[PDB]
Amino acid sequence: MAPLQQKQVVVSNKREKPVNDRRSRQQEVSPAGTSMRYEASFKPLNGGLEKTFRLQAQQYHALTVGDQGTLSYKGTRFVGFVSRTPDNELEHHHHHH
């Protein structure tokens, strides 16, 4: 059993660490060049090592760096990120233009 552990974190910086596929069964690192899976660093407000989770391009485009907000994770397993003010809470339905 695992409850949704939610704590407010800082989206500090984007990161990119090289990846290797599990099928390689490598006994060594040996990066497979690069990848389009951009990583986001979630820093705990109470101090600690940044939680660098790997995201897709479409996913990284969904959040903003600097946006302090709630993080929903279960241990080391990333579930979802909860922005305080999502895009549509700024981009409202009533416009002048």
mmCIF file with all atom_site columns, all heavy atoms in Angstrom, residues 10-12 59-68 81 83 85 87:
data_model
loop_
_atom_site.group_PDB
_atom_site.id
_atom_site.type_symbol
_atom_site.label_atom_id
_atom_site.label_alt_id
_atom_site.label_comp_id
_atom_site.label_asym_id
_atom_site.label_entity_id
_atom_site.label_seq_id
_atom_site.pdbx_PDB_ins_code
_atom_site.Cartn_x
_atom_site.Cartn_y
_atom_site.Cartn_z
_atom_site.occupancy
_atom_site.B_iso_or_equiv
_atom_site.pdbx_formal_charge
_atom_site.auth_seq_id
_atom_site.auth_comp_id
_atom_site.auth_asym_id
_atom_site.auth_atom_id
_atom_site.pdbx_PDB_model_num
ATOM 1   N N   . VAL A 1 10 ? 10.038 22.891 -5.418  1.00 0.00 ? 10 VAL A N   1
ATOM 2   C CA  . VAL A 1 10 ? 10.421 23.891 -6.401  1.00 0.00 ? 10 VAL A CA  1
ATOM 3   C C   . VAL A 1 10 ? 10.902 23.223 -7.682  1.00 0.00 ? 10 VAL A C   1
ATOM 4   O O   . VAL A 1 10 ? 11.808 22.391 -7.648  1.00 0.00 ? 10 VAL A O   1
ATOM 5   C CB  . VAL A 1 10 ? 11.551 24.807 -5.874  1.00 0.00 ? 10 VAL A CB  1
ATOM 6   C CG1 . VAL A 1 10 ? 11.960 25.831 -6.923  1.00 0.00 ? 10 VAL A CG1 1
ATOM 7   C CG2 . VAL A 1 10 ? 11.130 25.503 -4.594  1.00 0.00 ? 10 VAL A CG2 1
ATOM 8   N N   . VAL A 1 11 ? 10.275 23.565 -8.801  1.00 0.00 ? 11 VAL A N   1
ATOM 9   C CA  . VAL A 1 11 ? 10.788 23.169 -10.103 1.00 0.00 ? 11 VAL A CA  1
ATOM 10  C C   . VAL A 1 11 ? 11.987 24.048 -10.434 1.00 0.00 ? 11 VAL A C   1
ATOM 11  O O   . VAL A 1 11 ? 11.836 25.157 -10.948 1.00 0.00 ? 11 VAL A O   1
ATOM 12  C CB  . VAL A 1 11 ? 9.720  23.300 -11.209 1.00 0.00 ? 11 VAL A CB  1
ATOM 13  C CG1 . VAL A 1 11 ? 10.248 22.775 -12.537 1.00 0.00 ? 11 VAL A CG1 1
ATOM 14  C CG2 . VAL A 1 11 ? 8.446  22.573 -10.809 1.00 0.00 ? 11 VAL A CG2 1
ATOM 15  N N   . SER A 1 12 ? 13.167 23.554 -10.103 1.00 0.00 ? 12 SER A N   1
ATOM 16  C CA  . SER A 1 12 ? 14.371 24.366 -10.122 1.00 0.00 ? 12 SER A CA  1
ATOM 17  C C   . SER A 1 12 ? 14.975 24.497 -11.515 1.00 0.00 ? 12 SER A C   1
ATOM 18  O O   . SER A 1 12 ? 15.154 25.610 -12.013 1.00 0.00 ? 12 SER A O   1
ATOM 19  C CB  . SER A 1 12 ? 15.391 23.770 -9.153  1.00 0.00 ? 12 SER A CB  1
ATOM 20  O OG  . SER A 1 12 ? 15.484 22.367 -9.329  1.00 0.00 ? 12 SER A OG  1
ATOM 21  N N   . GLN A 1 59 ? 5.350  16.741 -21.883 1.00 0.00 ? 59 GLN A N   1
ATOM 22  C CA  . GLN A 1 59 ? 5.126  16.806 -20.443 1.00 0.00 ? 59 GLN A CA  1
ATOM 23  C C   . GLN A 1 59 ? 5.897  17.964 -19.825 1.00 0.00 ? 59 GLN A C   1
ATOM 24  O O   . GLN A 1 59 ? 5.368  18.694 -18.994 1.00 0.00 ? 59 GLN A O   1
ATOM 25  C CB  . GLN A 1 59 ? 5.540  15.493 -19.781 1.00 0.00 ? 59 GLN A CB  1
ATOM 26  C CG  . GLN A 1 59 ? 4.778  14.283 -20.297 1.00 0.00 ? 59 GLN A CG  1
ATOM 27  C CD  . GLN A 1 59 ? 5.249  12.987 -19.672 1.00 0.00 ? 59 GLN A CD  1
ATOM 28  O OE1 . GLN A 1 59 ? 6.413  12.850 -19.302 1.00 0.00 ? 59 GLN A OE1 1
ATOM 29  N NE2 . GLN A 1 59 ? 4.354  12.021 -19.567 1.00 0.00 ? 59 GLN A NE2 1
ATOM 30  N N   . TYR A 1 60 ? 7.148  18.131 -20.238 1.00 0.00 ? 60 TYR A N   1
ATOM 31  C CA  . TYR A 1 60 ? 7.974  19.233 -19.754 1.00 0.00 ? 60 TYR A CA  1
ATOM 32  C C   . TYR A 1 60 ? 7.352  20.575 -20.142 1.00 0.00 ? 60 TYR A C   1
ATOM 33  O O   . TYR A 1 60 ? 7.482  21.567 -19.426 1.00 0.00 ? 60 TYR A O   1
ATOM 34  C CB  . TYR A 1 60 ? 9.399  19.114 -20.310 1.00 0.00 ? 60 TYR A CB  1
ATOM 35  C CG  . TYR A 1 60 ? 10.282 20.300 -19.987 1.00 0.00 ? 60 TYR A CG  1
ATOM 36  C CD1 . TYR A 1 60 ? 10.664 20.577 -18.680 1.00 0.00 ? 60 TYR A CD1 1
ATOM 37  C CD2 . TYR A 1 60 ? 10.727 21.146 -20.994 1.00 0.00 ? 60 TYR A CD2 1
ATOM 38  C CE1 . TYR A 1 60 ? 11.462 21.667 -18.387 1.00 0.00 ? 60 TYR A CE1 1
ATOM 39  C CE2 . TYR A 1 60 ? 11.527 22.234 -20.711 1.00 0.00 ? 60 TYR A CE2 1
ATOM 40  C CZ  . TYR A 1 60 ? 11.890 22.492 -19.407 1.00 0.00 ? 60 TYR A CZ  1
ATOM 41  O OH  . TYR A 1 60 ? 12.678 23.583 -19.123 1.00 0.00 ? 60 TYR A OH  1
ATOM 42  N N   . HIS A 1 61 ? 6.651  20.582 -21.264 1.00 0.00 ? 61 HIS A N   1
ATOM 43  C CA  . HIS A 1 61 ? 5.969  21.778 -21.750 1.00 0.00 ? 61 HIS A CA  1
ATOM 44  C C   . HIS A 1 61 ? 4.718  22.088 -20.912 1.00 0.00 ? 61 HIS A C   1
ATOM 45  O O   . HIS A 1 61 ? 4.101  23.142 -21.067 1.00 0.00 ? 61 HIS A O   1
ATOM 46  C CB  . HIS A 1 61 ? 5.600  21.577 -23.228 1.00 0.00 ? 61 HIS A CB  1
ATOM 47  C CG  . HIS A 1 61 ? 4.834  22.708 -23.846 1.00 0.00 ? 61 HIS A CG  1
ATOM 48  N ND1 . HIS A 1 61 ? 3.476  22.658 -24.061 1.00 0.00 ? 61 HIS A ND1 1
ATOM 49  C CD2 . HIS A 1 61 ? 5.240  23.915 -24.307 1.00 0.00 ? 61 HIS A CD2 1
ATOM 50  C CE1 . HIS A 1 61 ? 3.078  23.777 -24.629 1.00 0.00 ? 61 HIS A CE1 1
ATOM 51  N NE2 . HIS A 1 61 ? 4.127  24.560 -24.791 1.00 0.00 ? 61 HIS A NE2 1
ATOM 52  N N   . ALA A 1 62 ? 4.359  21.181 -20.009 1.00 0.00 ? 62 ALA A N   1
ATOM 53  C CA  . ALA A 1 62 ? 3.128  21.324 -19.236 1.00 0.00 ? 62 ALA A CA  1
ATOM 54  C C   . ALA A 1 62 ? 3.351  22.064 -17.918 1.00 0.00 ? 62 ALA A C   1
ATOM 55  O O   . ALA A 1 62 ? 2.394  22.516 -17.286 1.00 0.00 ? 62 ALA A O   1
ATOM 56  C CB  . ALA A 1 62 ? 2.506  19.959 -18.976 1.00 0.00 ? 62 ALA A CB  1
ATOM 57  N N   . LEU A 1 63 ? 4.604  22.195 -17.500 1.00 0.00 ? 63 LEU A N   1
ATOM 58  C CA  . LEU A 1 63 ? 4.910  22.888 -16.250 1.00 0.00 ? 63 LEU A CA  1
ATOM 59  C C   . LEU A 1 63 ? 5.914  24.009 -16.483 1.00 0.00 ? 63 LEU A C   1
ATOM 60  O O   . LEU A 1 63 ? 6.505  24.115 -17.556 1.00 0.00 ? 63 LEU A O   1
ATOM 61  C CB  . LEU A 1 63 ? 5.431  21.925 -15.167 1.00 0.00 ? 63 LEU A CB  1
ATOM 62  C CG  . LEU A 1 63 ? 6.779  21.250 -15.445 1.00 0.00 ? 63 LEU A CG  1
ATOM 63  C CD1 . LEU A 1 63 ? 7.401  20.764 -14.146 1.00 0.00 ? 63 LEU A CD1 1
ATOM 64  C CD2 . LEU A 1 63 ? 6.612  20.081 -16.402 1.00 0.00 ? 63 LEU A CD2 1
ATOM 65  N N   . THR A 1 64 ? 6.096  24.851 -15.475 1.00 0.00 ? 64 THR A N   1
ATOM 66  C CA  . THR A 1 64 ? 6.963  26.011 -15.593 1.00 0.00 ? 64 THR A CA  1
ATOM 67  C C   . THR A 1 64 ? 8.056  25.995 -14.524 1.00 0.00 ? 64 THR A C   1
ATOM 68  O O   . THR A 1 64 ? 7.796  25.686 -13.360 1.00 0.00 ? 64 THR A O   1
ATOM 69  C CB  . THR A 1 64 ? 6.140  27.310 -15.478 1.00 0.00 ? 64 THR A CB  1
ATOM 70  O OG1 . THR A 1 64 ? 5.036  27.259 -16.392 1.00 0.00 ? 64 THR A OG1 1
ATOM 71  C CG2 . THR A 1 64 ? 6.994  28.537 -15.780 1.00 0.00 ? 64 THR A CG2 1
ATOM 72  N N   . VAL A 1 65 ? 9.279  26.316 -14.930 1.00 0.00 ? 65 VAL A N   1
ATOM 73  C CA  . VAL A 1 65 ? 10.398 26.404 -14.001 1.00 0.00 ? 65 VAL A CA  1
ATOM 74  C C   . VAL A 1 65 ? 10.229 27.603 -13.074 1.00 0.00 ? 65 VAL A C   1
ATOM 75  O O   . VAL A 1 65 ? 9.970  28.720 -13.526 1.00 0.00 ? 65 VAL A O   1
ATOM 76  C CB  . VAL A 1 65 ? 11.742 26.502 -14.755 1.00 0.00 ? 65 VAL A CB  1
ATOM 77  C CG1 . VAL A 1 65 ? 12.884 26.848 -13.810 1.00 0.00 ? 65 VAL A CG1 1
ATOM 78  C CG2 . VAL A 1 65 ? 12.030 25.195 -15.472 1.00 0.00 ? 65 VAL A CG2 1
ATOM 79  N N   . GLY A 1 66 ? 10.369 27.358 -11.780 1.00 0.00 ? 66 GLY A N   1
ATOM 80  C CA  . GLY A 1 66 ? 10.167 28.400 -10.796 1.00 0.00 ? 66 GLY A CA  1
ATOM 81  C C   . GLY A 1 66 ? 8.827  28.267 -10.107 1.00 0.00 ? 66 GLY A C   1
ATOM 82  O O   . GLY A 1 66 ? 8.622  28.797 -9.011  1.00 0.00 ? 66 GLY A O   1
ATOM 83  N N   . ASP A 1 67 ? 7.914  27.538 -10.738 1.00 0.00 ? 67 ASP A N   1
ATOM 84  C CA  . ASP A 1 67 ? 6.580  27.365 -10.181 1.00 0.00 ? 67 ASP A CA  1
ATOM 85  C C   . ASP A 1 67 ? 6.615  26.418 -8.991  1.00 0.00 ? 67 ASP A C   1
ATOM 86  O O   . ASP A 1 67 ? 6.656  25.196 -9.146  1.00 0.00 ? 67 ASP A O   1
ATOM 87  C CB  . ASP A 1 67 ? 5.595  26.854 -11.237 1.00 0.00 ? 67 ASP A CB  1
ATOM 88  C CG  . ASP A 1 67 ? 4.191  26.677 -10.681 1.00 0.00 ? 67 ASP A CG  1
ATOM 89  O OD1 . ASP A 1 67 ? 3.660  27.635 -10.076 1.00 0.00 ? 67 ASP A OD1 1
ATOM 90  O OD2 . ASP A 1 67 ? 3.605  25.591 -10.867 1.00 0.00 ? 67 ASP A OD2 1
ATOM 91  N N   . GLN A 1 68 ? 6.675  27.001 -7.805  1.00 0.00 ? 68 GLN A N   1
ATOM 92  C CA  . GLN A 1 68 ? 6.568  26.239 -6.572  1.00 0.00 ? 68 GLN A CA  1
ATOM 93  C C   . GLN A 1 68 ? 5.159  25.677 -6.445  1.00 0.00 ? 68 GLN A C   1
ATOM 94  O O   . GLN A 1 68 ? 4.180  26.427 -6.503  1.00 0.00 ? 68 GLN A O   1
ATOM 95  C CB  . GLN A 1 68 ? 6.871  27.122 -5.362  1.00 0.00 ? 68 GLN A CB  1
ATOM 96  C CG  . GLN A 1 68 ? 8.188  27.876 -5.454  1.00 0.00 ? 68 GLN A CG  1
ATOM 97  C CD  . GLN A 1 68 ? 8.442  28.739 -4.234  1.00 0.00 ? 68 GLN A CD  1
ATOM 98  O OE1 . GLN A 1 68 ? 7.504  29.201 -3.581  1.00 0.00 ? 68 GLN A OE1 1
ATOM 99  N NE2 . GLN A 1 68 ? 9.706  28.973 -3.922  1.00 0.00 ? 68 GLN A NE2 1
ATOM 100 N N   . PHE A 1 81 ? 2.391  16.146 -10.826 1.00 0.00 ? 81 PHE A N   1
ATOM 101 C CA  . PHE A 1 81 ? 2.742  17.445 -10.270 1.00 0.00 ? 81 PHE A CA  1
ATOM 102 C C   . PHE A 1 81 ? 1.516  18.349 -10.248 1.00 0.00 ? 81 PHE A C   1
ATOM 103 O O   . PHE A 1 81 ? 0.773  18.421 -11.226 1.00 0.00 ? 81 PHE A O   1
ATOM 104 C CB  . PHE A 1 81 ? 3.872  18.083 -11.091 1.00 0.00 ? 81 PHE A CB  1
ATOM 105 C CG  . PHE A 1 81 ? 4.248  19.470 -10.646 1.00 0.00 ? 81 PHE A CG  1
ATOM 106 C CD1 . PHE A 1 81 ? 4.841  19.683 -9.412  1.00 0.00 ? 81 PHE A CD1 1
ATOM 107 C CD2 . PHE A 1 81 ? 4.008  20.562 -11.467 1.00 0.00 ? 81 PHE A CD2 1
ATOM 108 C CE1 . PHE A 1 81 ? 5.186  20.957 -9.005  1.00 0.00 ? 81 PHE A CE1 1
ATOM 109 C CE2 . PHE A 1 81 ? 4.352  21.837 -11.065 1.00 0.00 ? 81 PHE A CE2 1
ATOM 110 C CZ  . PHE A 1 81 ? 4.942  22.036 -9.832  1.00 0.00 ? 81 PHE A CZ  1
ATOM 111 N N   . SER A 1 83 ? 0.476  22.055 -9.961  1.00 0.00 ? 83 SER A N   1
ATOM 112 C CA  . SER A 1 83 ? 0.781  23.477 -9.981  1.00 0.00 ? 83 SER A CA  1
ATOM 113 C C   . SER A 1 83 ? -0.275 24.244 -9.193  1.00 0.00 ? 83 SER A C   1
ATOM 114 O O   . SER A 1 83 ? -1.453 23.878 -9.205  1.00 0.00 ? 83 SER A O   1
ATOM 115 C CB  . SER A 1 83 ? 0.830  23.978 -11.427 1.00 0.00 ? 83 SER A CB  1
ATOM 116 O OG  . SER A 1 83 ? 1.131  25.362 -11.486 1.00 0.00 ? 83 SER A OG  1
ATOM 117 N N   . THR A 1 85 ? -1.159 27.468 -9.677  1.00 0.00 ? 85 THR A N   1
ATOM 118 C CA  . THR A 1 85 ? -1.932 28.192 -10.663 1.00 0.00 ? 85 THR A CA  1
ATOM 119 C C   . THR A 1 85 ? -1.657 27.644 -12.060 1.00 0.00 ? 85 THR A C   1
ATOM 120 O O   . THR A 1 85 ? -0.755 28.120 -12.751 1.00 0.00 ? 85 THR A O   1
ATOM 121 C CB  . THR A 1 85 ? -1.597 29.694 -10.631 1.00 0.00 ? 85 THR A CB  1
ATOM 122 O OG1 . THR A 1 85 ? -1.418 30.121 -9.275  1.00 0.00 ? 85 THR A OG1 1
ATOM 123 C CG2 . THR A 1 85 ? -2.704 30.514 -11.280 1.00 0.00 ? 85 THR A CG2 1
ATOM 124 N N   . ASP A 1 87 ? -2.176 26.740 -16.129 1.00 0.00 ? 87 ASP A N   1
ATOM 125 C CA  . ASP A 1 87 ? -2.270 27.679 -17.247 1.00 0.00 ? 87 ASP A CA  1
ATOM 126 C C   . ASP A 1 87 ? -3.678 28.247 -17.412 1.00 0.00 ? 87 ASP A C   1
ATOM 127 O O   . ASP A 1 87 ? -3.844 29.450 -17.589 1.00 0.00 ? 87 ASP A O   1
ATOM 128 C CB  . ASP A 1 87 ? -1.825 27.006 -18.548 1.00 0.00 ? 87 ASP A CB  1
ATOM 129 C CG  . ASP A 1 87 ? -1.834 27.960 -19.725 1.00 0.00 ? 87 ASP A CG  1
ATOM 130 O OD1 . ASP A 1 87 ? -0.900 28.782 -19.837 1.00 0.00 ? 87 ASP A OD1 1
ATOM 131 O OD2 . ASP A 1 87 ? -2.771 27.893 -20.546 1.00 0.00 ? 87 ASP A OD2 1
#
